[PDB]
Amino acid sequence: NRAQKLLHYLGHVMVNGPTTPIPVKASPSPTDPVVPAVPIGPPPAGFRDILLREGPEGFARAVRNHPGLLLMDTTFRDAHQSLLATRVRTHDLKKIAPYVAHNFSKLFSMENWGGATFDVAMRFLYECPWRRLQELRELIPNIPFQMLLRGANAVGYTNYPDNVVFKFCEVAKENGMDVFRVFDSLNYLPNMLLGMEAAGSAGGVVEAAISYTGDVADPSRTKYSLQYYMGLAEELVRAGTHILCIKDMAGLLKPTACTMLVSSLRDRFPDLPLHIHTHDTSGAGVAAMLACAQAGADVVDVAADSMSGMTSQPSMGALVACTRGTPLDTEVPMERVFDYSEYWEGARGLYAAFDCTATMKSGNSDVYENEIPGGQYTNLHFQAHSMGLGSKFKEVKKAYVEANQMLGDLIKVTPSSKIVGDLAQFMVQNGLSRAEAEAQAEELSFPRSVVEFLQGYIGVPHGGFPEPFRSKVLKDLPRVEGRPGASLPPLDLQALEKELVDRHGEEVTPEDVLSAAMYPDVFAHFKDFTATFGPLDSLNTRLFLQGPKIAEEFEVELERGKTLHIKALAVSDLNRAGQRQVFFELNGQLRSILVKDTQA
Amino acid sequence: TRGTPLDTEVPMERVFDYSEYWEGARGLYAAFDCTATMKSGNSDVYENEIPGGQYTNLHFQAHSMGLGSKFKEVKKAYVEANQMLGDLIKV
């Protein structure tokens, strides 16, 4: 039934390995983290109260006129991709919410979702991000929430019908999501326009970001000029925004660049709040970060110190220590930060089998010449080292820049980063050179992602795309021009709902429908896997990944009344055809279950 | 130090290949390493005043014998121990 389901799952776990590959021969350490104590009464006041009480622009004016500085935490989304394979369960995260709210109250809001919030939580993690965000609201009625959003594509890598994004924003407002970060990988203006328009139409604060690239301090850089960025900012604010941001996954924000860009932003709008978000990858996050904070910055994005350094965002403890005897007046009890960071350090030791510190043990430099996203850099290095790519993985990264150059130097975050990635992968695995690729490419085959990009689904960049290569490779394929969202006919989601109901549903809800609208195959895989092995989100980290050691007693809580105690007794051996018998002990019941081995 | 009068003027390409070489040679001594034990550079170095060359083997011992939760008590009385020996400049 239900308990027998999870027992079957545990048997499969013990006999086999985990479904997700384990690239590195390592096991979780036997050191559990320590939870500091907090009171039971209501938490101190943050900024969610202002939104629940005042209009959004009134809140923005209050923030702009608020004396000092503010932080907006990000320890749920970006540190995952920057450091791990974005493989941190909600079980570890359902133990901090009482601590932070009852202690921290000056935080602006929280970042929960982002780029790798669905795929990894649908491919290698068997959880539901909808259910992940649904119950996070009841524990923090103190600090609002924000997600990272992609404009043209709703949550995927290719453009989708606009009304899909409309329902996306509507349900995001309905469930408890508070703030949006509207942004698209390229500078295709209609993408940002549609994203902000949908965010406003759904009803809620619209916060926009602009990707930054290159050295804005050098006049030699011309493709993304100085006045280019201010023109973009002016036209978007003319379209109507609440807070402006300068997006940096590459972490190339420089102090002189910092001060000049912040000054330029501040002249024409010393009225709207300025937002910033970056990755302390090269190791220069804090310095230029505080330069921007001193100059004109208002909202700051930071994660915990245990997931700091390396490639992720700057630590909150360092800035609080530096900006305490400062007019910005952080003025938050900073001793609690010690125990919070130490809790997270204790919790980090579990996922030692996968991390960016697997082989590259130190922080990532050379992003100033690689301009690869850190959240994607860690994933690339992880998968390559899983494939045993060592020093030869150096050239795997090397082919990326020429792929960009042949495709034209364009800004890349969600889709285009992956497109250049697998394009360079193919380009280098064929052992190809640039001269012949430019000369002869029509006969040369390419991955379907290259063709999809060349068709024009993502959109036209600022600098355009070369005509000869697309003409040679595309042959006579149809070409999509303008906004593909308008070009793509709107599709009825009611029929998809009926299809999913007829497949496995009778009370299913539309959030499942849109999660399938990500990709139906992964949704079907997840649905069958859950309908086979049992309900998740009651199992520990090492229990999920490594498994319970023999003769070890454990407790798992799923419902309000169903309490159970489990201890592992023993396992049988290969009898005739990989059939094993396992004996488990419940609180008062003891049963033996057969499990099917597959290595024969 | 690029648009500043400090004028580092160091060829910044060879620094890269130096970095990857030193990453390669660092992995040779992979049996014991600070990063392997302590995952990332951390705060709380303020009230501890640990010398740089001592925190390594100190946390080494702490997590080698499993004093993850007992390491905080080591630094809890560290200030009091020093003040018993008098507030001292220590190397």
Swiss-Prot record, chain A:
PTM-bearing positions, type Phosphothreonine: T509
Residues with the N6-carboxylysine modification: K247
Phenotype for M249I: In PC deficiency; mild
PTM remark: Acetylation of Lys-254 might play a role in catalytic activity regulation.
Cofactor: biotin; Mn(2+)
Pathway: Carbohydrate biosynthesis; gluconeogenesis
Disease: Pyruvate carboxylase deficiency: Leads to lactic acidosis, intellectual disability and death. It occurs in three forms: mild or type A, severe neonatal or type B, and a very mild lacticacidemia.
Catalytic activity reported: hydrogencarbonate + pyruvate + ATP = oxaloacetate + ADP + phosphate + H(+)
GO CC terms, sorted: cytoplasm; cytosol; mitochondrial matrix; mitochondrion
Shown stretch of the complete protein: 495 to 1094 of 1178
Keywords: Acetylation, ATP-binding, Biotin, Disease variant, Gluconeogenesis, Ligase, Lipid biosynthesis, Lipid metabolism, Manganese, Metal-binding, Mitochondrion, Multifunctional enzyme, Nucleotide-binding, Phosphoprotein, Pyruvate, Transit peptide
Result after altering F583 to A/E: Loss of tetramerization and enzyme activity, resulting in an inactive homodimer
Keyword Phosphoprotein tagged: yes
Highest taxon listed in the record's lineage: Eukaryota
Sequence positions bearing N6-acetyllysine: K95, K167, K223, K254, K398, K475, K498, K567, K596
Catalytic activity, EC: 6.4.1.1
Cell compartment(s), UniProt: Mitochondrion matrix
Effect of R137Q: In PC deficiency
Domain named Pyruvate carboxyltransferase: residues: 69-338
Protein's gene: PC
Protein name: Pyruvate carboxylase, mitochondrial
Functional summary from the UniProt entry: Pyruvate carboxylase catalyzes a 2-step reaction, involving the ATP-dependent carboxylation of the covalently attached biotin in the first step and the transfer of the carboxyl group to pyruvate in the second. Catalyzes in a tissue specific manner, the initial reactions of glucose (liver, kidney) and lipid (adipose tissue, liver, brain) synthesis from pyruvate.
Top EC class, one word: ligase
Cofactor annotation remark: Binds 1 Mn(2+) ion per subunit.
Binding positions for substrate per the UniProt entry: R77, D78, A79, H80, Q81, R150, T414
Complexes and interactors: Homotetramer. Interacts (via the biotin carboxylation domain) with SIRT4.
GO BP, one annotated term: positive regulation by host of viral process
